Design a protein around this motif. Sequence first.
Motif, PDB file in Angstrom:
ATOM      1  N   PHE A 259       0.836  -1.190   0.000  1.00  0.00           N
ATOM      2  CA  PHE A 259       0.000   0.000   0.000  1.00  0.00           C
ATOM      3  C   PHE A 259       0.875   1.246   0.000  1.00  0.00           C
ATOM      4  O   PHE A 259       2.035   1.211   0.419  1.00  0.00           O
ATOM      5  N   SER A 260       0.302   2.354  -0.479  1.00  0.00           N
ATOM      6  CA  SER A 260       1.038   3.610  -0.540  1.00  0.00           C
ATOM      7  C   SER A 260       1.413   4.134   0.840  1.00  0.00           C
ATOM      8  O   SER A 260       2.309   4.978   0.944  1.00  0.00           O
ATOM      9  N   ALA A 261       0.751   3.662   1.894  1.00  0.00           N
ATOM     10  CA  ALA A 261       1.069   4.048   3.258  1.00  0.00           C
ATOM     11  C   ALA A 261       1.338   2.801   4.088  1.00  0.00           C
ATOM     12  O   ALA A 261       0.766   1.736   3.842  1.00  0.00           O
ATOM     13  N   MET A 262       2.223   2.945   5.076  1.00  0.00           N
ATOM     14  CA  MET A 262       2.623   1.804   5.891  1.00  0.00           C
ATOM     15  C   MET A 262       1.489   1.318   6.786  1.00  0.00           C
ATOM     16  O   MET A 262       1.414   0.125   7.094  1.00  0.00           O
ATOM     17  N   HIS A 263       0.609   2.220   7.210  1.00  0.00           N
ATOM     18  CA  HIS A 263      -0.401   1.930   8.218  1.00  0.00           C
ATOM     19  C   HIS A 263      -1.745   1.516   7.634  1.00  0.00           C
ATOM     20  O   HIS A 263      -2.705   1.356   8.393  1.00  0.00           O
TER      21      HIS A 263
ATOM     22  N   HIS B 263      -0.752   6.343  14.260  1.00  0.00           N
ATOM     23  CA  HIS B 263      -1.070   6.798  12.914  1.00  0.00           C
ATOM     24  C   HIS B 263      -2.398   7.537  12.817  1.00  0.00           C
ATOM     25  O   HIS B 263      -2.820   7.868  11.705  1.00  0.00           O
ATOM     26  N   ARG B 552       4.863   8.250  -0.575  1.00  0.00           N
ATOM     27  CA  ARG B 552       5.520   7.509   0.498  1.00  0.00           C
ATOM     28  C   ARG B 552       6.489   8.399   1.265  1.00  0.00           C
ATOM     29  O   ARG B 552       6.542   8.357   2.502  1.00  0.00           O
ATOM     30  N   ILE B 555       4.513  10.728   3.502  1.00  0.00           N
ATOM     31  CA  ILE B 555       4.011  10.040   4.690  1.00  0.00           C
ATOM     32  C   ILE B 555       5.130   9.840   5.706  1.00  0.00           C
ATOM     33  O   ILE B 555       4.948  10.070   6.911  1.00  0.00           O
TER      34      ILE B 555
END
Lengths: 590, 590
Positions: A259-263, B263, B552, B555
Amino acid sequence: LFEVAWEVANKVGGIYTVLQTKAKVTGDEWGDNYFLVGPYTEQGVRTQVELLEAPTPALKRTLDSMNSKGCKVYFGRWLIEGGPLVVLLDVGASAWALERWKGELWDTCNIGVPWYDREANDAVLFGFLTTWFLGEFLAQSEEKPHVVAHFHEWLAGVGLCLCRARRLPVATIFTTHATLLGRYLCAGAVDFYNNLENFNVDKEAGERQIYHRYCMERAAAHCAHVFTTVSQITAIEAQHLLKRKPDIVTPNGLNVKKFSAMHEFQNLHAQSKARIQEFVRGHFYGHLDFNLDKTLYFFIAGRYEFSNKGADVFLEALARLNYLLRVNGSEQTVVAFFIMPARTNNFNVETLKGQAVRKQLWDTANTVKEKFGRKLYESLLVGSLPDMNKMLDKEDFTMMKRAIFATQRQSFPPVCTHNMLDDSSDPILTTIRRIGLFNSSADRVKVIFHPEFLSSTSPLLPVDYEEFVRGCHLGVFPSYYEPWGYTPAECTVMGIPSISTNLSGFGCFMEEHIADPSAYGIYILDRRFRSLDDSCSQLTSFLYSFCQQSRRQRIIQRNRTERLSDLLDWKYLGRYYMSARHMALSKAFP
Amino acid sequence: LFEVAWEVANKVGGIYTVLQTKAKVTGDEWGDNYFLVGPYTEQGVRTQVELLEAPTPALKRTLDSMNSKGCKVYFGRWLIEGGPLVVLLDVGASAWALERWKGELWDTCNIGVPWYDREANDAVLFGFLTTWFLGEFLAQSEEKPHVVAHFHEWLAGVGLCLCRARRLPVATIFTTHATLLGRYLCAGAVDFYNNLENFNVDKEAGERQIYHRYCMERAAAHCAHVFTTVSQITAIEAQHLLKRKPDIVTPNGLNVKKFSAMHEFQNLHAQSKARIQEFVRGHFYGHLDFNLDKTLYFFIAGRYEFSNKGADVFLEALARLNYLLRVNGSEQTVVAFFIMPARTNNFNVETLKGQAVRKQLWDTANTVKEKFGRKLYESLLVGSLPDMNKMLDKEDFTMMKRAIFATQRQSFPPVCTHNMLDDSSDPILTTIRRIGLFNSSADRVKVIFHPEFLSSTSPLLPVDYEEFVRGCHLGVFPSYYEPWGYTPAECTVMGIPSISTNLSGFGCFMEEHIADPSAYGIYILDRRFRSLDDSCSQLTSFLYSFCQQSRRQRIIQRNRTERLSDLLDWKYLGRYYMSARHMALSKAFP
Ligand SMILES: O=c1ccn([C@@H]2O[C@H](COP(=O)(O)OP(=O)(O)O)[C@@H](O)[C@H]2O)c(=O)[nH]1
Ligand SMILES: O=c1ccn([C@@H]2O[C@H](COP(=O)(O)OP(=O)(O)O)[C@@H](O)[C@H]2O)c(=O)[nH]1
Ligand SMILES: O=P(O)(O)OC[C@@H]1O[C@@H](O)[C@H](O)[C@H](O)[C@H]1O
Ligand SMILES: O=P(O)(O)OC[C@@H]1O[C@@H](O)[C@H](O)[C@H](O)[C@H]1O
Ligand SMILES: OC[C@H]1O[C@H](O)[C@H](O)[C@@H](O)[C@@H]1O
Ligand SMILES: OC[C@H]1O[C@H](O)[C@H](O)[C@@H](O)[C@@H]1O
C-alpha cells in the motif's frame, strides 16, 4: 514452463494459493512461454476462468491439431493478470477408455489406481491427458525449444512416469508440498517426530492405504531430474522416507499487497474488526453484557484436521485462559473463531434470527434517529437549544420498549453457526461441550464454530477470508504436523500476530531468520521437545500474555509483525525456483 | 497563583492559546489554588465561560466583600476541565471614574494611557480592577498564604507598578511574549537584527508611539521580582533594549492530543484533506483540468502582518515555483491558502455560487445514482448481469447534459473568498495581481486568500483551524520578526511539516535540540545571514524539494515531524515555569 497441478481452477487451500501467488512473478520474469495445466470440475471453475475455445496464437497448433480428436482442452486467463495462459483439461469428457490407460500403466510402471477412490482415478486420467497435450505440442513445435515440465503433489505425479516411458526430451522437476504418508501416520495416534528412520513404509502403506500413491510418488521422485520440497523439515522426511534427497529447498512465498502508506493494514484491520463486531452483536443478542472494546478475536482456520491443525490444544488453552480470566476478575473477553469446513445442511435458526434481530434493532434505532434529527433540525432552525425532553413522545418510547422486549433471550448463543448433520461425532463440538464452554454470561471466552470457508457473498459474515483475518487480533495455529503452513504466513503478511510451531515449515523458517522471535508477534510454540500438557500450558501462557498487553502494545506488535512481510515475499523466495529450473536445464540439456 | 492576562475569554492568537494549553497541567500539578484574571467583552465570551455569580467556596469572601460595591466580578470554568477557576472582570461596568485612576497613576509612577487608543485605556482599567480584587482577597484571607502574581504582556503590566506602590506582599513574575517595540520597528522598513545595541529607545518611542507602553513595560520589568521571556532570542532583545535580563527562558509548549494509535493523525489528515478537496472542487468549478491526487495544500496562517509573518517572500516563492513547475512539464499542482484576517463585508458571489454548483452536481449525480442503483437491484433480483446500456434513459442523460452546461464558466476562479472593502490597498491581493497569479488553467499554483479565521460553523469551509491544518501538506511560515511562533508548533505537533526561520523562537528552539534539521520536516530557512532575494530563492528550493518527493516520502516525513511533538509538550516545557515560581518565592519570602 509447464506447472501442471490439480488445484488451478478449483478452490483448495493447498496448491491453489501457491500457484496463484507465484504466477504473477513467474510470468513477468519469463514471459508468455508460461503454461498452466489443470482439471475441469462442474463447480463454477469457468466463472473465474476466461476460456478461449477459439484458436489463439502462442501454441495455436494444438487447438487445430488435437482438440477435434475426442479430447477437450481450453485456454484461459484466470482473471489474474500475471499472464497465466492456463491449459484447462476436462476430466469427464474423456473417460470411456480407462481400461486401455490402466493397461498402459501396467506396461509402463506397474502402477495405477484402484476403483475405491475416484479422486486418484481422476488424477491419473488428468495426467494422461496432460501427457498427450505435451506430446502433441512437442510434435507440432518441431521440438525447437526445450520446455521444462514441473509437477506438484501426487495428484499430478503420473506425468513423471508417463513422460519417462516415452522418453520425451523435457526437463522434469517435481515438488511435493506434503508427504501424504506422513499426514496419515500423524493422524494414527502414533509418534512421528521422535524417530523417522524406524518406519517401515511398505508395512504402513495399505492398512491405511497410500500404497499405490506412495509407489507412484517415489517413482516420480526417483525418475524426476530435479526433486524439491517446501521447507527444510520437509526435505528431512523426504530423504528419510522417499529415499530421494531434494536438490534444493523451495520455501513458499506470497504476493504481498503493498500500500502507498505503511499503516493502511491497520485501517483495514479496523474496518474488518468493525464488521466482525457487527456479526458478534448479531450473534450475542440479548447477551451483550461484556464490553466490546475489551474483546479480542482469535481464530484457527484451514482444513478440518483436528489433531493435525492443532484444534484440541487450542480448545484446551481456551478453556484454561477462560478459567484464568474468570478467577482474575478481568474485563477482557475473547471471541475465538473456528473456520474448519465440515459438511452441514444449512444455517441454524438461532444465528440467522440473531442477525435479523440485530438489524431490526438497527432499523428501530434508525427510525428514532430520523425523528430526533428532524425535531432537532426544527429546533436549530428556530434558534433554540433543545431541552431534550420535548422531542421524544410516547409512541417512540413504546416501540423502543417493544423492541427491547422482543430481543430478550433466555437460551445461550449457539457455538455453531450452521446446522451440522452429525453433532454427536464432531470432534470440535464434542470437546467444546466437554470443556464446558457455551458462550455463557460468566464465560470470559466465547467460541464460534463456522464450519465453512468464508465468502464475501454469504447471508451472514459477508467477508472473504483475507478481510476476516485482517479483522482478527491473533491467529493461533498450533499445528502438530503440517509441511509449511499458509495461514500464519498471510496472517503475518497482513500484520496479524500468529502462534506457529517448531514442527511447522513457517515456524522453522522464521526460527533461524530472526534473532529472538516472539518479539515480532511470532509466538513460536515448542511441540517437539514438550509433552501435550506442557504444550497446552505454553499455549495458555502465550494467550494470557497476549491478553494482558494494552491497545498500544497490540498496535506496536502488529506493526512489528507486518514488518516481516518481506521475508515471505515471492521476490525474495522466488530465487529457489529459478535455481531449480537452472539445475533442470543443466541436467536435461544445456 | 494569579495568571492575569488580557486574552482569557476573547480569542486572539497570542496569550489565549498559551494560557489555554498551560491551564491543564498548571492546575493538575498544583490544584484549586490557581486563579485566572481577564477582561469582559460583549463578543460572546460568556458562551465559552460558565459564569458563577452566586457565592462559591475557594475564595468565597470576595463575592460578598467587594462585588456589591460598584464593581463587577464573575467566576468561571471555561468549559475546559483543567480546573481553571477564572476571575472575569467587566471593563465597561466600572469606567465612570477614570480621572481618579489617572491621578493615581500620576502619583504612583507618572504613567498612564493617552485618549488616542482605547485598547490601552481598557487594559489599564482592567489592571486597576485586578489590583483591587487581589488586595481585597488578601484583606479577606488575613494574608495567611503567600500567593504568586504572574503577568503577561503590557495589556496587564500596570499591575506590577500598582502592586509595588501599595507594597502588597506577593511574589511578582512578569513574562513578556513579544517586545512590541521590536515588532513596530521591524515593520518600519529598517534592519533590526544586524544591530541591537545601536537603537535609541526614547527617540524611536513616540514617532511610532509606544512611549507610555515602553515606559510601563520597562517599569514592570525592573520592579518585577522575576522577569521571563519566551525564547532565547527573546531574552536577547529584552536584555539589550529593556535593560533587564530575564531570570530564565520559558519556551512555549502545547497540550498535545495523544491518540491510542500512532497513525491516527494520518487518518485525521486524510479526512481533513478530503474536506479541503471538496472545498477546492467547489471553488474551481468548470476548471477541474488538473489532477487532484497531485495537489498539495500549502498555507500561511496567523495575524495579518505582511512583512513580519513572511507573506511577501512566500508569494515570491510561490510564483517562482509556479514558473519551475510550468517549465518542467509537471503534473503536480499546489493550492496555497492565506489565512490572514482582513476586514471584509461578506463573501463574494463567485465563491458561494461555486460551492452551490459543486453540491448541485453532487445532487444530480446522487439522483442518477439512486436511479441506477434501483435498476441494478432489479437486475440482480431477476438474476441477470447488467448490460449497462438498458438502465440509463434519455431523461437522465438530458439532466446530466443540462447540469454540465450549467457549470460551464468563462471567468477564472477568484483569489479571495470574501468581499474585502479595500482591494486597491490590500498588500496580499496587490502582490498576487503583480506576480500574475489568477488561478488560470496554465498556472501550476492556485492561491486562495481566506481573509478570516477558520470556524467549524462557516457557510463554506466548515472546518476549525486545527482540522484544516491537519488537512494541509506543508505549513510555510517564513516570518521575519516574531518571538516564538505558535502556528509551526502545532503544525509539527499535528504532524504537518513546516518551514520555520532562524529568526523565529520555534526555529531557534528546534535548531539546537535536533542534529541535522530538515530531516524531520523542519525546513529551517536562514533569514539573518542572507538577503531577501537569497531567502526567496532558498524558499523556492525548499518548496520544489517538497514537491518532488512522492506520497511515500511525504508520509514518512509526516511521521518524522510528528515524532517531535514531545519536545514542545508542556510536560517537558513546564519545568521552566516551576523554576520561575520557585525563584519568585525565594526572592519574596521563603
Ligand atoms: O476460510 C478459509 C480458510 C482457509 N483458507 C485458505 O486455506 C489455506 C490454508 O493452507 P495451509 O497451508 O494453512 O493448510 P492446508 O489447508 O493447505 O492443509 C490458506 O491459504 C487460506 O487462504 C481459505 O481460503 N478460507
Ligand atoms: O485561522 C486561524 C489562524 C491562526 N489561529 C491561531 O493563531 C495563533 C498564531 O499565533 P502565532 O504565535 O503564530 O502568531 P500571532 O498570531 O500570535 O502573532 C495560533 O495559535 C493559531 O491557533 C487560529 O486560531 N485560526
Ligand atoms: O483492535 P485493537 O487491538 O484494540 O486495535 C485498535 C485499532 O487498531 C487499528 O485498526 C487502528 O490503529 C485503529 O485506529 C485502532 O483503533
Ligand atoms: O496527501 P498525501 O500527501 O498524498 O498523503 C496520502 C494520505 O496520507 C495519510 O492521510 C494517510 O496515510 C492516507 O492513507 C494517505 O492516502
Ligand atoms: O506445504 C505447502 C502447503 O500445502 C500443502 O499441500 C498442505 O496442504 C499444507 O499443509 C502445506 O502447508
Ligand atoms: O511569543 C509568543 C507568541 O505570542 C506573542 O504574543 C506574539 O503574538 C507571537 O508572535 C508569539 O510567537
